[PDB]
Design an enzyme around this catalytic site. Structure first.
Site, mmCIF file in Angstrom:
data_model
loop_
_atom_site.group_PDB
_atom_site.id
_atom_site.type_symbol
_atom_site.label_atom_id
_atom_site.label_comp_id
_atom_site.label_asym_id
_atom_site.label_seq_id
_atom_site.Cartn_x
_atom_site.Cartn_y
_atom_site.Cartn_z
ATOM 1 N N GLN A 24 -3.890 -0.452 -6.413
ATOM 2 C CA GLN A 24 -4.361 -0.027 -5.097
ATOM 3 C C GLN A 24 -5.579 0.875 -5.238
ATOM 4 O O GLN A 24 -5.660 1.658 -6.176
ATOM 5 C CB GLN A 24 -3.241 0.706 -4.331
ATOM 6 N N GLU A 50 -2.891 3.499 -8.675
ATOM 7 C CA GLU A 50 -4.060 3.782 -7.857
ATOM 8 C C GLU A 50 -5.267 4.183 -8.687
ATOM 9 O O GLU A 50 -5.180 5.081 -9.516
ATOM 10 C CB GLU A 50 -3.782 4.879 -6.820
ATOM 11 N N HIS A 64 -1.713 13.396 -8.086
ATOM 12 C CA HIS A 64 -2.311 13.026 -6.811
ATOM 13 C C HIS A 64 -3.688 13.645 -6.553
ATOM 14 O O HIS A 64 -4.602 12.954 -6.112
ATOM 15 C CB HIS A 64 -1.372 13.340 -5.636
ATOM 16 N N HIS A 83 6.697 6.537 -3.105
ATOM 17 C CA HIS A 83 5.445 7.270 -3.070
ATOM 18 C C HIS A 83 5.554 8.480 -3.979
ATOM 19 O O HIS A 83 6.292 9.410 -3.678
ATOM 20 C CB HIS A 83 5.220 7.718 -1.629
HETATM 21 ZN ZN LIG Z 1 -1.362 7.044 -3.654
#
Ligand SMILES: [Zn+2]
Length: 267
Positions: A163, A126, A59, A16
């Site tokens: 994702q 992502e 992020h 992650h």
């Molecule tokens: Zn993520």
């Protein structure tokens, strides 16, 4: 009658934001550590985008938390964004894990990441709702092609997972390229809001489901697996939760501590 990972792992270890427990998230330092040192299965990347259109790893939509800057990523050009220190925040916040070499770590571009770790690495990337960065899907697939990762050998071997929380982002990718494995991300509280019909229509584009781990029971994990999902809960940092979920029959976790999950696979 249950689908497994495409990588040929029973339990896959998604690093992650890289080795984000031990190193500043979404940096070369962090991705180096989880890929080369800790031997995690995935490099996990969140995409933002600069003013001049470069896909980057961060992020949040803003640079505030993880840099010495302020403002949205899209208010920085790439040149300007590359002046920022993306590592010193981590030394302040986690002084037991601090390193002098983390100072003036850089925000990496997606292009740089795929170059650095190459076509044999696996990537868990992502995307956003299609209204925050329009074009980002097409850009992402184009950068993947350029780096020889949309080759269908690479795809059925789990080298690319894409994702998103956004259905419309994932549906867009499924249309442009039906071979790319897709992972539907589920919010805290949200998995229980969804019936079998909903889970069936997700299943028509997503092989993967990524719920908050605290929403998972043994009953529901088994149900999702029976519906044909690969299940990868996020973010599991404690060994007791890791073992509990592995015994439910998840296929892997997103984790800040890749060594700890790989120990639980062992122990
Ligand atoms: Zn993520």
């Amino acid at each position: 009658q249950w689908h497994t990972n495409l990588t040929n792992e029973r339990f896959t270890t998604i690093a992650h934001r890289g080795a984000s427990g031990y190193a500043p998230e979404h940096t070369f330092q962090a991705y180096d550590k989880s890929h080369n040192e800790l031997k995690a299965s995935y490099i996990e990347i969140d995409l933002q985008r600069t003013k001049d259109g470069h896909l980057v790893a961060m992020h949040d939509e803003t640079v505030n938390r993880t840099t010495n800057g302020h403002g949205k990523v899209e208010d920085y050009t790439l040149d300007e964004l590359k002046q920022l220190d993306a590592g010193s925040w981590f030394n302040k916040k986690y002084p037991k894990y601090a390193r002098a070499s983390y100072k003036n770590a850089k925000v990496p571009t997606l292009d740089e990441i795929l170059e650095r770790y190459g076509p044999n690495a696996n990537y868990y990337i992502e995307t956003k709702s299609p209204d925050v960065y329009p074009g980002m899907e097409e850009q992402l697939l184009a950068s993947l092609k350029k780096h020889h990762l949309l080759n269908n050998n690479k795809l059925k071997n789990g080298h690319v997972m894409i994702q998103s929380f956004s259905d419309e982002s994932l549906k867009k990718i499924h249309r442009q390229n039906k071979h790319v494995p897709l992972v539907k991300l589920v919010d805290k509280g949200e998995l229980q809001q969804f019936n079998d019909q909903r889970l069936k229509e997700i299943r028509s584009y997503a092989i993967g489901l990524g719920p908050d781990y605290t929403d998972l029971t043994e009953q529901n994990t088994h149900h999702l697996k029976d519906l044909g999902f690969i299940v990868h809960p996020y973010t599991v940092n404690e060994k007791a939760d890791m073992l509990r979920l592995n015994k439910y029959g998840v296929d892997g976790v997103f984790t800040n501590f890749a060594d700890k999950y790989k120990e639980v696979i062992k122990e």
